Structure formats: C-alpha cells, structure tokens
C-alpha cells in the first residue's frame, strides 16, 4: 500500500508471522537493527508505521501503478502550469 | 612588441597548420596590449606597423587595455596608419561622416587629439547571428538559472521562515529607524513648505523594502504548488 | 495584401530587414487608413534595444500620419526629448516630414529645446526639421526671428561646433534658399 | 618529382616470430619500411608516411609526415597483441587519406599481412568494390602463410585492380631463407 | 574524486565556431574537440580549448580518426604561450552517445589522464543545461557484468571569472541581471512549470516506452531507487503542516501590514502635494 493510510497495526505482522504480541517489539527491533528500514512509530496504542524500503526484486503492479501515479502527477503539473501561466502570461508576461 | 620577436617560421608554421584545417583565412593585422601609459602607439609600434603594412594595405591594429578600464564598459577601439605624403591634402577624406558621432565616444582630451596628428582611428561595429543569439542567450540565462530549474526555489521558499525572518525584522528596524524621523517631518512640513533641503526621499527606499517583502507573497504560491502537486 | 508579409518579416533576426519592414509598411499604409501598424511601430520604437529600428521607426508614423499636422507633435512631443539621441534624431525627422509645407507652430515652439544639446545628432535633425518648416513663410504672420537668427549663427559659430553640425547647418540653410523662394515642396 | 602519400599497415600478431622463417622478420620488414621510406625520401622528400597496425583496436602510431626521424623510434614497441583485423584496417586508412596536408599527393596504401584473412568472400568483394570505387592504389603484400597462398585473394586482386594500364601490382613472396627486401623491391612500387 | 566542474562559455562559443567554419559541405558530424582545463585543483575549470580533424565512417561506427602530432603541436605551442593550463579531456557535439566513444576516449585515457566527457546538442533548442560532465571511470556492477567504462554524470556550472561576463553583457544588451523583485521572480514562477514540464514530459515518454519495449539491460536496478524516491512522498495528509501554513500565512500577514502601512506612508507626499500644489498654482496663476 503506497498511500491511503500507510499507518498499520501489529495484528497483520503477528497474523502473518504466527508470533505472539510479546515478540513483535523484538521483531521490529531486529528489523531496525538490520538497517533495511528506518521506521519510527510515535504511537500510543500499538501501531506499525513504516518508512523508506527497497523492493530489490520486481513489482509489475507498481510499474503499472507507477505509470498511473506518474502520469497523474505529470498531468497535474501540466494543469497547474497551463492554469497559472494562462492568465499569468496575459496579465504579467 | 618588436619585429624581431615575430618568428616567421613559427608564424608561417601555425598559419600552415591553420591552412591544413578548416581555417582558410589570411592574416589581416596584429594586436597587443598597452597597460598603464595609455592605448597610444610608441615609435617602435609605429615602426613595426610601418614594416607590417607593406603586404596588407589595410593593416588593422587593435589595442586592448582592460587593466584600468572598469568592468562596466568594454569599449575597444581600432587604430590605423595614415600616409605621410597626405599632409598637403586633407587628412582623412572619408565619406559617410555619420558614424563619426559614434567614433566620438573615446573623447579623452589628451590622447585622441593630444596625439591625433599622423595617428587616427576607425569605427567599430558588431555582428551576431541567430546561433550565437540563442546559444549564447540561452547559455547566459542558464548561467543565471539552475540545473533542473526547480532546485533552489524551495530553498528560498523555506528560507523565508528561517533566514529571511531576520532580514524582515532588520527591515522593520530600518523602517522604524526612518519613521522616527518621519515623526519630525510634519513639523518642518508644517512650518516652511517652501524648498527642499534633505536629499533623502524616504519613499523609493521603502518601495524597495516592499519589493524585498513581496518575495514571501510570490513564493507562497510556490509553496502552494509544491504542497499541492 | 502585405499584412502577413510585413507581420511575418517583422520578427526577423536582421535589424536592417527590421527597418525594411517599417520602411516597407510606411508607403503601404499612407492616408492614415490603419491604426494597427502604429502599435508595433511605437512598440518596436520603445521595446527594441537596437537604435536602428528606433530611429527608423517613426518615419513610417509620419508617412501614415502626414494628413493631420496638429496631431503629430502631441504624440511625438515625448520623443522630442527621448532617452537616447537616436529617437531624438528620428523624431526630428518625423517633425520635419509631418509639418513640412504647413504652418503649425506646435513643432516650432518645440524647436528651441531641440537646437541646444551636447549631442550633434539632435542638433543636425533639429536644424533640418527647422529648415523644412520655415520654407514658404512670412515674418509678419509668425515670429520666426528666433530660428532665423539661431539658424544664421551656425555658419559663424562653426569654428566652435562639430564638423557635421556645420554640414547639417549649411545644408539646412540651403533648404530655404532653394529655388530663390519660388519653388517649394508638398506632400 | 612524385607527389603521393604512403600508408603502411604492419601485423602485430604472434605469427611473426615463428622460427621456421626469418629470425623475427618483424625487424626485416621494419628495415623494408626503412628502405622504402628512405628511397621515397631520396626520390621526393615531401612525401608523408603514416604508421598503423591491423589489430582489433587500431591506433595511429604516427601521423602522415615526411619527418622519419621520430618514425624510426615509433617503429619500436609494436605491442604484440591481437591476431588480425581487415575491415577497420582498410577503413582506418583509406578513409583517413582525406586528412593529408597536400591535396595533390596521390593515394597509395600498402599493407603487411602476416595472418590468415578472417573475412569471407563477400567482404572481399564489398571492400574490393569500395577501393575500386574510390580509385585508391592498393598494394597487397602477404608475408607468411598457413593455407594456400592465393585462392580467393587472386579474384580479390583482379576485382580490386582497376586501370589495367600502369595500375597496381600484387606482391606474392614464396617461402625461402633469403631476405624479403630484395624480393619486395623487385616490382616498380619500390623506386 | 571530483564533485563539480566549471565550464566557461568560451569553449561553447568555440563550438559555435565549430558550426561556423563548416563551409556548407553536408557532413555536420560529431566534431571532436580537445577540451583543456586545470586538473590541479579538485574543481575543474575550463579556460579555453581547440579542435582536431575528426572524421568517422557512415556505416561502421568503430571508425575514428585522431591525430597525435597535431595534439602535441597545438598543446606544445599553447603550453608555450600559457603553461597554466594543460590537457584534461575532450568533448563531442553529438546528441547521442555512440559505442565508439570508449575507443575515442580510451586514447586520451592512455596518453592523457582521466578525461571528462561532455555531451552537447548541435541545435540550441534544448531548454535544459547543454553541458553534462561525464567522468570516465570504471565501476563495479552488482549484477555481475564485466567491468567496463561508465559515464557518471557530474554536476556542472557555467560561470565567467573576470572579463567574459563583461563581454557577454556588452554583446547581448538584452539579458537582465539578477534584479530581485517583481519581474525576475514572476518570470521564473511562470515559466518554471514548463521548465520541468518539458524535461519530465520529454523523459517519461521514452522511459515508459523502454519499460515494455526495452531489452539489453538498461540497469533496471536503479529503477527501484527511482520509483522508491518517487514513492517517498506518498501524498502527505498535510495534518501536521497546518501550523506551518499558519506560520507562513502569518508572515503573509506581516507582509500585508508592511505593504498597507508603508504605502500609507508613501501616500503622504502625494496626497499633500496634490492639494498644496494645485490650489496654490491655481490661485497664483492669474
Ligand atoms: Zn610599455
């Protein structure tokens, strides 16, 4: 999930790793000890917030989604350029 | 600068190496620099000019002197040699006397007419094609622009909150530092109203302060675009 | 016909051809039939950085606005004392061609600031423009003693003046004496 | 005298040090370059002589110049690497003939071939058609052999050699302990 | 080794000369020039350069023609007249990087020290910076491919030290200086969206083309960092930055008070002289 409430909880980690709730702190502590993730969570109730990570193998749905979000960003920057520059060039030049 | 310093085998060697390349142009003149004592030509320079003008009838001579010349103007002048037998007739029977007004820009009161006898000059014009205009123009605009042109924008957009705040507080310190006198101005303006004695205008400086203050307004929309998309 | 030709050739990189577009559109729009060309005439007279189209610009303005002599000095009075001397000289040619053969004093009262300046260009074009108006005029109608005397003092003051200032001075004096006051010019 | 450019291509493979033929004949053909460059110098000292090999990565050892004093030094450090390269060996000189100073100098290129040709007959007829097309004097000198001397190279020369009148000559040296200088100096190309 | 380089416009105007002395022959190939500079200091500074007759073949790309005697003679005389500058590298005017550039650059890697490569455009239609410094160094690849010459992009800047700024400013008479304020800021704020639009739009089209229609590995490994950094800004909800909008908008309020108050101070002389001058000139006119 690249966007749409990146914030998560330990229930998916413990459910996918069939581990108890007492070992998830050592699990994320080892995850931060390896150095592949820099995630620091300011949570009060148990939550899992993550940061920069590298796939390093492949992702085709992220290639197509990369084209979708990339084209969306490009047409939004183009829309703002034509919008601001449209009347801005006519009134200021 | 002397005729003995000009090596004919070195000159002809480099000219031949230019002939084997895409430079099929013959020599048209020789130039040098005269620092300090002025751009005028001594006896040795006019003697090697007299010796070097036997082949080319024109013999263009240019003297560059950027040592004492300010960086505001790079005005350069080309020199010429007059015939010694023309002293009986008119000095320079040159038509199209319009450009002499443009040749009157070097109007030093010692060198031009201080040594104008047997030593005159010629006008200089420039030329620029579209390749130099767009390549050098876009090259200079890029020389004042960034690499991707989007790098150093957010630097100032976010420095408005860290560094420019000090320049805004100091700017208000100069504003109040003038307003403390502008409190006393309505007394004189309420007494005399005739004539102006203070060379300070107190208006255009504050206009410039407003121009420096409008950077926050102009870059606020930039932060709105960076935050938006 | 020449709308797309002059409009296309106006953006040329050559300043000489840029002058050729205005000189070309000068005779094409004679009769004050187009109020559009003046937009780019004055727009290139003020906007362009090269003084060639700036001093060669307003000649088309006078060639199209030659019909009314009064309306010219009202819009070229700013160009009488312009920023650079080139627009002052070309504007002096404009006052010379727009008020020629007429009796409008709106340029004559402005000739006195034109005739005194350290630049010899505005002095030459000022003497020519003053020479193109004093032709076919009597003294009892208008007080021309000022420009007659200041025009006569240029050939005696040529010792302390420029070499081209006396050229345009006596060349300006040959305009009034042309044909012994019998022949004149008409636009 | 004779105004023409001279280009020589020498082999730098390890096929030039076999003990059956001359004792490292690289020096012998080096003396051949010496006697043809000094012979052309005696005929017309204004002729320029270039030096380049036929390795994979061709490198211009010496630019076309009549001064052979430094060419004598450049004939050393042959860097005996690679085996043979024909296409860019022809294209590296026949196309470089336009970089000469004197435009009046005719086009003449020789080559010392000490390795079997790796190009098929199609490249032989395409390159022969190119050289006959641009009309460049080409002298083929083949030192040493493994298979028969001339099987397809005969038709390569016959199709490459145009202008039958006083045209180019083919140099084919048989095996023998005698030197190669007098054997390659027999045709009219030397002198 | 080298973090940034400095390229003077004199060499690019010497490329304008490369396009001037052609002679209308019909070749206009990638004429290679011998780049000169100061390799002593860590930063690279190009002062001037010269050229060498360079000709390639139509079909075969591996054909390249250089000259050693011309390089040693032009470099010898140039070092005799100015010994403060020495050989550093070369540069070609071709817009495309051909395979033969490893062999062309390899000669100046053997004889000369590590040469930097600069790719420019024959037509100055590209809005981006025409100069790109490409260092010729061999890098180890993680996929296991054999070590080969790699051209890493080094940042470059176009600056003039003493005189070329004056000469360019005098020859142009059209470009403007920094001139902080309304125009120089609003022009950048207007055309900047096109300055990024032509670059990104010009790049992601051929990029997306080479995504599906690509082979001959293009170093797909760096694409993971590409999309990674692109996904390092996952549309922040702006919840925490609200107070930052209150700070920047409060500075906006400060600019409002400064504009209104200071302009209200400027209205003094105008809104006083308009009365005292008009009524006195009117009452004293006749
Ligand atoms: Zn001296």
PDB file of C-alpha atoms in Angstrom, chain D residues 57-63 65 70 87-88 91-99 130, chain E residues 53-60 62-70 103 106 110-111:
ATOM      1  CA  UNK D  57      41.739  -1.604 -31.648  1.00  0.00           C
ATOM      2  CA  UNK D  58      43.642   0.235 -34.369  1.00  0.00           C
ATOM      3  CA  UNK D  59      45.850   3.082 -33.142  1.00  0.00           C
ATOM      4  CA  UNK D  60      47.502   5.728 -35.316  1.00  0.00           C
ATOM      5  CA  UNK D  61      51.155   5.387 -34.315  1.00  0.00           C
ATOM      6  CA  UNK D  62      52.459   8.285 -36.430  1.00  0.00           C
ATOM      7  CA  UNK D  63      50.613  10.947 -38.404  1.00  0.00           C
ATOM      8  CA  UNK D  65      54.658  13.415 -42.090  1.00  0.00           C
ATOM      9  CA  UNK D  70      60.685  10.048 -34.966  1.00  0.00           C
ATOM     10  CA  UNK D  87      37.707  -4.239 -42.336  1.00  0.00           C
ATOM     11  CA  UNK D  88      38.658  -1.422 -39.965  1.00  0.00           C
ATOM     12  CA  UNK D  91      38.667   1.787 -43.407  1.00  0.00           C
ATOM     13  CA  UNK D  92      41.147   3.244 -40.886  1.00  0.00           C
ATOM     14  CA  UNK D  93      43.496   4.450 -43.651  1.00  0.00           C
ATOM     15  CA  UNK D  94      41.574   4.633 -46.939  1.00  0.00           C
ATOM     16  CA  UNK D  95      39.030   6.912 -45.259  1.00  0.00           C
ATOM     17  CA  UNK D  96      41.816   8.745 -43.389  1.00  0.00           C
ATOM     18  CA  UNK D  97      43.501   9.677 -46.690  1.00  0.00           C
ATOM     19  CA  UNK D  98      41.464  12.912 -46.674  1.00  0.00           C
ATOM     20  CA  UNK D  99      43.329  14.218 -43.598  1.00  0.00           C
ATOM     21  CA  UNK D 130      34.785   0.124 -52.330  1.00  0.00           C
TER      22      UNK D 130
ATOM     23  CA  UNK E  53      40.195  16.984 -37.543  1.00  0.00           C
ATOM     24  CA  UNK E  54      37.828  14.132 -36.650  1.00  0.00           C
ATOM     25  CA  UNK E  55      36.026  12.023 -39.260  1.00  0.00           C
ATOM     26  CA  UNK E  56      34.040   8.798 -38.885  1.00  0.00           C
ATOM     27  CA  UNK E  57      32.527   6.274 -41.288  1.00  0.00           C
ATOM     28  CA  UNK E  58      28.930   6.190 -42.487  1.00  0.00           C
ATOM     29  CA  UNK E  59      28.138   2.518 -41.854  1.00  0.00           C
ATOM     30  CA  UNK E  60      30.848   1.312 -39.468  1.00  0.00           C
ATOM     31  CA  UNK E  62      34.076   1.801 -34.878  1.00  0.00           C
ATOM     32  CA  UNK E  63      35.951   4.110 -37.292  1.00  0.00           C
ATOM     33  CA  UNK E  64      37.539   7.108 -35.571  1.00  0.00           C
ATOM     34  CA  UNK E  65      40.330   9.414 -36.741  1.00  0.00           C
ATOM     35  CA  UNK E  66      42.523  11.395 -34.341  1.00  0.00           C
ATOM     36  CA  UNK E  67      45.979  12.981 -34.508  1.00  0.00           C
ATOM     37  CA  UNK E  68      48.921  12.854 -32.099  1.00  0.00           C
ATOM     38  CA  UNK E  69      51.286  15.283 -33.844  1.00  0.00           C
ATOM     39  CA  UNK E  70      48.615  17.988 -34.091  1.00  0.00           C
ATOM     40  CA  UNK E 103      37.721   3.816 -28.034  1.00  0.00           C
ATOM     41  CA  UNK E 106      40.484   5.370 -24.476  1.00  0.00           C
ATOM     42  CA  UNK E 110      46.142   6.005 -22.151  1.00  0.00           C
ATOM     43  CA  UNK E 111      48.165   9.058 -23.183  1.00  0.00           C
TER      44      UNK E 111
END
